[PDB]
């Protein structure tokens, strides 16, 4: 439209284009109406490349823009209304200055090029701030901080310095109910867990270099907690074989030429169920009113559904011994399994050692774990606590009973 | 084994003597070529009308 | 300077002064590069408005590393410090507690469908003579019983 | 900094000032005090790290908790008998576990594809429906692989990265024994689109100049056994 | 070997690296005029020969464009981080919010988690049921004895 001052604004024409479109985005932005404008002109400046002076230099405006709009979105409802646009258009950030699309599969962006060199900055500013609450957050809050590190990891290559986090074992890993409900065998049986689980599952390294008091320490706080789950988990087969045998054998002994097969013991649905239509439309009815008790706006400030809170003794009592939910046994061997394997390979291969030492050293010169003296008597009580826990006692055990979850836990720690 | 024959036809277009290397992909052809004729064989050479023989005794 | 929002608009009208400023010496500039006497009053307002935008400057960057330090300040507070005043802990937790009590039944009621069901003997009898091999997995209970379970 | 005039001057009266020594560091331009090359190394260490790295959790024994969760879930999901009608459930359930502890896009898609692979035989269905909803799906530029012409386009080529990765270790002795349900499972994802062709057949272990060389080695001993023939041994010696 | 002093000294700089593109542009741009001006009131002046601008009045229209231009990029830039402070607050107090009152939402869960329990009895006592068909069963099939 003014298309007068065509000497006068001949100085900067680029700069003049970058500078009204932000002031739109951002009169526009301060909805359903806003969020069409921004995007109309986002894609607006994509398109109207070719046109400007300089080609490449849409790169660093594009971007520009789409940082002003991440900014000032209201709530992360409006957030997450909104990032299935950044989602589509994704292979157009992969291009940092070519005006020619890319092969899909290949992205030509670094951590400190000229494009992320404050943008990445930026979005990690936000994503460590979303990850510093830790109390007050909304389900909308996490699927927010997924959304966001799902897109940054896919923007980078795989192979990029910045794209795979170098050695940094992850504390603040707690799943207590966020300082809320937080208060005999009970009692016994939480110290204990939650003794084992601090020294060994939350710092490896530590008591995987120690002193020969805290490896047996930790060893005769850790055994009975072991054979207390073992045996459970025996009692559960046990009922599971035990219900099967005797329909088999009744079974077999009711026809004429059956001869069962004892071997196959794979869960099935049961007759009179498999071919019902009332009891599927109840529990398909039961269902959606649960899930939409869970998706509403009223209830998003609920824990997963898998935590433990180590905090409340006696849920957790509640949640480990029952024999009819086996789940949080199962989490708490994978636990132990990833773990000692990674102790294991730390104490024998003498060749990780040297990395961990080095990623220890360069974050901190100044240090206390030894790194070299693994004189013998330690080294020996260690390395032969993981093969007792690890391989003699676990594995040993869900060779015979559940061959399923075996090929699991063996297939995840190769 | 899977069904999905076009990418091992577009392979052993290129490179024929592979299948010097092992058998089976030779009988695994043939099971799907076997399939994918089979009911053209049955229209003719009328076995439909006689595949009714092919049951168990009772005990 | 005390709150992050506050010390951002302290530094937008840090701004302000500096812009009249710039704007007023870069017009006295063009009158004195123009193509005497109105050139030589110009010579000595430029001397007269540099008397006054170093000092103005100097204020937009003490400002800036003020912002700066009040932000950092701010983003220490964890979300626990911020929860510690809430009024009925009680309600909390019996809300929390509840949750877990819902999610462990539900685990048992889906363990308890298929994987610990317990079925029917299975005893089999076909009718039709034509029948000469029996699947042994499409056997079903009869009608009448069917509905009582 | 402001004035107009300076020099070194401003340097050495810093150097020689040590009260407000960290002040210095803090805002103005320091490069020159914290001159120790130890000191200089290790502040280009702990810019990358702390400013540009993304803080996630990639390796099964860095976020243990995390991952434990997620993959009890998964077996939860091939033990459910409506599992089929609660798909976007778990997608839900999958999407507040990864948010919660930061665990990484690649790593997760392993994990997933692992302990599905060890249930494929008769998981397949609900496999297959949760990988088509969940945005790990290329939805935009699906793959084809049922016609010549487009037997190397599309895809999502993470995906082909793992699995190619995953395919190519065969010398440990545990995995020898999973090889074959690992293969199946992508064998069926390779035909749904999910991966194109060509980018898991460039990139599995035996290159293709090796597998030439056994096909040269074959033709020719095959040949000269053919033509020549051997004297099998009865009684000889 | 370093000292903790200096360790510490490396890691406060590494905590404060600001890299905000839109002030240093501004910041510039104000010394390239105080370089000028400042000149001109020495009365060096010269034809550019070391970097001090250029008299020419030419370019003196183009240092007017990029002060108008680098200047309204900074204020928009404050203005925009102001606003996105403004409302994550707002946020945050608003799940605070939602914390004090959740006694409102102790009923519906109470009522699923005893809905839940019913189902679970009516399910384990059908089990009970269908072990009593089979054990008859059973007697009736080992030899006569009604």
Same mark, same amino acid.
């Given at each position: 439209?003014?298309?007068?001052?065509?000497?006068?604004?001949?100085?900067?024409?680029?700069?003049?284009?970058?500078?009204?479109?932000?002031?739109?985005?951002?009169?526009?932005?301060?909805?359903?109406?806003?969020?069409?404008?921004?995007?109309?002109?986002?894609?607006?400046?994509?398109?109207?490349?070719?046109?400007?002076?300089?080609?490449?230099?849409?790169?660093?405006?594009?971007?520009?823009?789409?940082?002003?709009?991440?900014?000032?979105?209201?709530?992360?409802?409006?957030?997450?209304?909104?990032?299935?646009?950044?989602?589509?258009?994704?292979?157009?950030?992969?291009?940092?200055?070519?005006?020619?699309?890319?092969?899909?599969?290949?992205?030509?962006?670094?951590?400190?090029?000229?494009?992320?060199?404050?943008?990445?900055?930026?979005?990690?500013?936000?994503?460590?701030?979303?990850?510093?609450?830790?109390?007050?957050?909304?389900? *909308? +809050?996490? !699927?927010?901080?997924?959304?966001?590190? /799902?897109?940054?990891?896919?923007? $980078?290559?795989?192979?990029? @310095? &910045?794209?795979?986090?170098?050695?940094?074992?992850?504390?603040?890993?707690?799943?207590?109910?966020?300082?809320?409900?937080?208060?005999?065998?009970?009692?016994?049986?939480?110290?204990?867990?939650?003794?084992?689980?601090?020294?060994?599952?939350?710092?490896?390294?530590?008591?995987?270099?120690?002193?020969?008091?805290?490896?047996?320490?930790?060893?005769?706080?850790?055994?009975?907690?072991?054979?207390?789950?073992?045996?459970?988990?025996?009692?559960?087969?046990?009922?599971?074989?035990?219900?099967?045998?005797?329909?088999?054998?009744?079974?077999?002994?009711?026809?004429?030429?059956?001869?069962?097969?004892?071997?196959?013991?794979?869960?099935?649905?049961?007759?009179?169920? *498999? +071919?019902? !239509?009332?009891?599927?439309?109840?529990? /398909?009815?039961?269902?959606?009113? $649960?899930?939409?008790?869970? @998706? &509403?706006?009223?209830?998003?400030?609920?824990?997963?559904?898998?935590?433990?809170?180590?905090?409340?003794?006696?849920?957790?009592?509640?949640?480990?011994?029952?024999?009819?939910?086996?789940?949080?046994?199962?989490?708490?061997?994978?636990?132990?399994?990833?773990?000692?394997?990674?102790?294991?390979?730390?104490?024998?291969?003498?060749?990780?050692?040297?990395?961990?030492?080095?990623?220890?050293?360069?974050?901190?010169?100044?240090?206390?774990?030894?790194?070299?003296?693994?004189?013998?008597?330690?080294?020996?009580?260690?390395?032969?606590?993981?093969?007792?826990?690890?391989?003699?006692?676990?594995?040993?055990?869900?060779?015979?009973?559940?061959?399923?979850?075996?090929?699991?836990?063996?297939?995840?720690?190769? | 084994?899977?069904?999905?024959?076009?990418?091992?036809?577009?392979?052993?277009?290129?490179?024929?003597?592979?299948?010097?290397?092992?058998?089976?992909?030779?009988?695994?052809?043939?099971?799907?070529?076997?399939?994918?004729?089979?009911?053209?064989?049955?229209?003719?050479?009328?076995?439909?009308?006689?595949?009714?023989?092919?049951?168990?005794?009772?005990? | 300077?005390?709150?992050?929002?506050?010390?951002?608009?302290?530094?937008?009208?840090?701004?302000?002064?500096?812009?009249?400023?710039?704007?007023?010496?870069?017009?006295?500039?063009?009158?004195?590069?123009?193509?005497?006497?109105?050139?030589?009053?110009?010579?000595?307002?430029?001397?007269?408005?540099?008397?006054?935008?170093?000092?103005?400057?100097?204020?937009?960057?003490?400002?800036?590393?003020?912002?700066?330090?009040?932000?950092?300040?701010?983003?220490?507070?964890?979300?626990?410090?911020?929860?510690?005043?809430?009024?009925?802990?009680?309600?909390?937790?019996?809300?929390?507690?509840?949750?877990?009590?819902?999610?462990?039944?539900?685990?048992?009621?889906?363990?308890?469908?298929?994987?610990?069901?317990?079925?029917?003997?299975?005893?089999?009898?076909?009718?039709?003579?034509?029948?000469?091999?029996?699947?042994?997995?499409?056997?079903?209970?009869?009608?009448?019983?069917?509905?009582?379970? | 900094?402001?004035?107009?005039?300076?020099?070194?001057?401003?340097?050495?009266?810093?150097?020689?000032?040590?009260?407000?020594?960290?002040?210095?560091?803090?805002?103005?331009?320091?490069?020159?005090?914290?001159?120790?090359?130890?000191?200089?190394?290790?502040?280009?260490?702990?810019?990358?790290?702390?400013?540009?790295?993304?803080?996630?959790?990639?390796?099964?024994?860095?976020?243990?908790?995390?991952?434990?969760?997620?993959?009890?879930?998964?077996?939860?999901?091939?033990?459910?008998?409506?599992?089929?009608?609660?798909?976007?459930?778990?997608?839900?359930?999958?999407?507040?576990?990864?948010?919660?502890?930061?665990?990484?896009?690649?790593?997760?898609?392993?994990?997933?594809?692992?302990?599905?692979?060890?249930?494929?035989?008769?998981?397949?269905?609900?496999?297959?429906?949760?990988?088509?909803?969940?945005?790990?799906?290329?939805?935009?530029?699906?793959?084809?692989?049922?016609?010549?012409?487009?037997?190397?386009?599309?895809?999502?080529?993470?995906?082909?990265?793992?699995?190619?990765?995953?395919?190519?270790?065969?010398?440990?002795?545990?995995?020898?024994?999973?090889?074959?349900?690992?293969?199946?499972?992508?064998?069926?994802?390779?035909?749904?689109?999910?991966?194109?062709?060509?980018?898991?057949?460039?990139?599995?272990?035996?290159?293709?100049?090796?597998?030439?060389?056994?096909?040269?080695?074959?033709?020719?001993?095959?040949?000269?056994?053919?033509?020549?023939?051997?004297?099998?041994?009865?009684?000889?010696? | 070997?370093?000292?903790?002093?200096?360790?510490?000294?490396?890691?406060?700089?590494?905590?404060?690296?600001?890299?905000?593109?839109?002030?240093?542009?501004?910041?510039?741009?104000?010394?390239?005029?105080?370089?000028?001006?400042?000149?001109?009131?020495?009365?060096?002046?010269?034809?550019?020969?070391?970097?001090?601008?250029?008299?020419?009045?030419?370019?003196?229209?183009?240092?007017?464009?990029?002060?108008?231009?680098?200047?309204?990029?900074?204020?928009?830039?404050?203005?925009?981080?102001?606003?996105?402070?403004?409302?994550?607050?707002?946020?945050?107090?608003?799940?605070?919010?939602?914390?004090?009152?959740?006694?409102?939402?102790?009923?519906?869960?109470?009522?699923?988690?005893?809905?839940?329990?019913?189902?679970?009895?009516?399910?384990?006592?059908?089990?009970?049921?269908?072990?009593?068909?089979?054990?008859?069963?059973?007697?009736?099939?080992?030899?006569?004895?009604?």
């Amino acid at each position: 439209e003014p298309l007068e001052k065509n000497i006068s604004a001949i100085h900067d024409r680029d700069s003049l284009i970058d500078i009204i479109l932000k002031r739109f985005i951002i009169d526009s932005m301060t909805l359903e109406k806003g969020l069409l404008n921004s995007c109309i002109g986002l894609d607006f400046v994509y398109n109207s490349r070719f046109n400007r002076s300089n080609p490449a230099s849409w790169g660093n405006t594009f971007f520009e823009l789409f940082s002003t709009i991440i900014d000032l979105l209201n709530s992360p409802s409006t957030f997450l209304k909104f990032w299935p646009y950044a989602e589509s258009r994704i292979e157009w950030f992969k291009m940092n200055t070519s005006v020619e699309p890319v092969s899909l599969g290949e992205s030509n962006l670094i951590s400190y090029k000229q494009p992320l060199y404050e943008k990445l900055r930026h979005w990690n500013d936000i994503l460590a701030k979303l990850e510093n609450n830790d109390i007050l957050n909304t389900v *909308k +809050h996490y !699927n927010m901080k997924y959304k966001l590190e /799902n897109f940054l990891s896919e923007l $980078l290559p795989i192979n990029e @310095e &910045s794209n795979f986090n170098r050695s940094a074992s992850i504390s603040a890993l707690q799943e207590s109910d966020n300082e809320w409900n937080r208060s005999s065998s009970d009692v016994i049986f939480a110290a204990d867990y939650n003794f084992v689980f601090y020294h060994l599952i939350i710092c490896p390294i530590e008591f995987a270099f120690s002193d020969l008091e805290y490896k047996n320490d930790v060893d005769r706080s850790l055994s009975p907690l072991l054979d207390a789950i073992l045996e459970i988990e025996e009692n559960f087969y046990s009922k599971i074989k035990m219900n099967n045998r005797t329909r088999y054998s009744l079974e077999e002994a009711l026809n004429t030429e059956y001869y069962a097969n004892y071997d196959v013991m794979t869960p099935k649905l049961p007759v009179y169920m *498999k +071919h019902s !239509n009332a009891m599927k439309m109840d529990r /398909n009815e039961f269902w959606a009113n $649960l899930q939409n008790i869970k @998706e &509403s706006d009223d209830y998003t400030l609920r824990p997963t559904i898998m935590d433990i809170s180590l905090s409340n003794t006696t849920c957790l009592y509640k949640q480990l011994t029952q024999e009819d939910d086996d789940y949080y046994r199962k989490q708490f061997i994978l636990q132990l399994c990833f773990t000692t394997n990674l102790i294991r390979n730390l104490i024998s291969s003498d060749e990780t050692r040297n990395f961990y030492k080095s990623c220890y050293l360069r974050e901190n010169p100044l240090s206390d774990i030894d790194f070299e003296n693994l004189d013998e008597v330690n080294k020996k009580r260690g390395l032969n606590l993981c093969s007792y826990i690890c391989d003699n006692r676990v594995l040993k055990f869900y060779k015979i009973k559940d061959p399923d979850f075996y090929r699991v836990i063996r297939k995840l720690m190769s | 084994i899977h069904g999905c024959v076009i990418p091992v036809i577009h392979v052993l277009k290129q490179y024929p003597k592979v299948l010097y290397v092992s058998e089976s992909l030779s009988r695994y052809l043939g099971r799907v070529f076997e399939y994918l004729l089979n009911p053209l064989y049955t229209s003719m050479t009328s076995s439909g009308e006689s595949k009714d023989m092919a049951t168990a005794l009772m005990i | 300077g005390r709150t992050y929002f506050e010390s951002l608009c302290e530094e937008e009208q840090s701004l302000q002064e500096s812009q009249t400023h710039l704007l007023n010496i870069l017009d006295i500039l063009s009158v004195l590069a123009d193509p005497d006497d109105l050139l030589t009053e110009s010579l000595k307002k430029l001397p007269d408005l540099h008397r006054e935008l170093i000092n103005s400057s100097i204020r937009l960057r003490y400002d800036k590393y003020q912002t700066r330090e009040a932000q950092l300040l701010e983003d220490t507070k964890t979300g626990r410090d911020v929860a510690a005043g809430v009024q009925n802990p009680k309600s909390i937790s019996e809300y929390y507690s509840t949750f877990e009590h819902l999610n462990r039944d539900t685990l048992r009621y889906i363990n308890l469908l298929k994987r610990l069901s317990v079925d029917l003997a299975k005893q089999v009898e076909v009718s039709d003579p034509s029948v000469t091999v029996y699947e042994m997995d499409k056997w079903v209970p009869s009608e009448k019983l069917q509905g009582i379970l | 900094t402001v004035p107009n005039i300076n020099d070194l001057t401003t340097i050495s009266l810093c150097k020689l000032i040590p009260s407000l020594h960290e002040e210095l560091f803090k805002f103005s331009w320091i490069s020159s005090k914290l001159l120790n090359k130890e000191q200089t190394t290790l502040l280009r260490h702990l810019l990358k790290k702390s400013k540009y790295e993304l803080k996630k959790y990639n390796l099964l024994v860095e976020n243990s908790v995390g991952y434990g969760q997620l993959v009890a879930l998964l077996i939860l999901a091939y033990y459910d008998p409506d599992n089929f009608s609660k798909v976007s459930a778990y997608l839900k359930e999958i999407y507040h576990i990864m948010g919660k502890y930061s665990l990484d896009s690649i790593r997760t898609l392993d994990v997933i594809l692992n302990v599905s692979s060890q249930f494929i035989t008769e998981g397949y269905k609900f496999f297959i429906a949760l990988l088509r909803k969940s945005d790990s799906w290329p939805s935009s530029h699906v793959a084809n692989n049922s016609n010549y012409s487009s037997l190397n386009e599309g895809g999502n080529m993470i995906a082909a990265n793992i699995i190619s990765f995953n395919l190519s270790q065969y010398n440990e002795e545990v995995d020898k024994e999973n090889y074959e349900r690992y293969m199946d499972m992508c064998c069926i994802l390779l035909k749904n689109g999910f991966v194109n062709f060509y980018s898991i057949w460039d990139n599995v272990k035996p290159e293709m100049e090796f597998l030439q060389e056994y096909i040269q080695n074959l033709e020719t001993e095959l040949e000269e056994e053919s033509t020549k023939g051997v004297e099998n041994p009865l009684a000889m010696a | 070997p370093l000292s903790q002093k200096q360790i510490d000294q490396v890691r406060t700089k590494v905590h404060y690296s600001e890299v905000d593109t839109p002030f240093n542009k501004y910041l510039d741009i104000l010394g390239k005029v105080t370089k000028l001006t400042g000149s001109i009131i020495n009365g060096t002046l010269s034809n550019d020969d070391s970097k001090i601008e250029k008299l020419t009045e030419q370019n003196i229209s183009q240092l007017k464009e990029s002060a108008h231009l680098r200047f309204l990029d900074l204020q928009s830039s404050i203005d925009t981080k102001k606003v996105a402070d403004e409302n994550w607050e707002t946020c945050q107090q608003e799940t605070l919010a939602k914390l004090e009152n959740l006694k409102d939402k102790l009923p519906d869960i109470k009522s699923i988690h005893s809905k839940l329990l019913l189902r679970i009895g009516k399910l384990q006592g059908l089990y009970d049921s269908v072990q009593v068909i089979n054990r008859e069963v059973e007697g009736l099939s080992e030899g006569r004895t009604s």
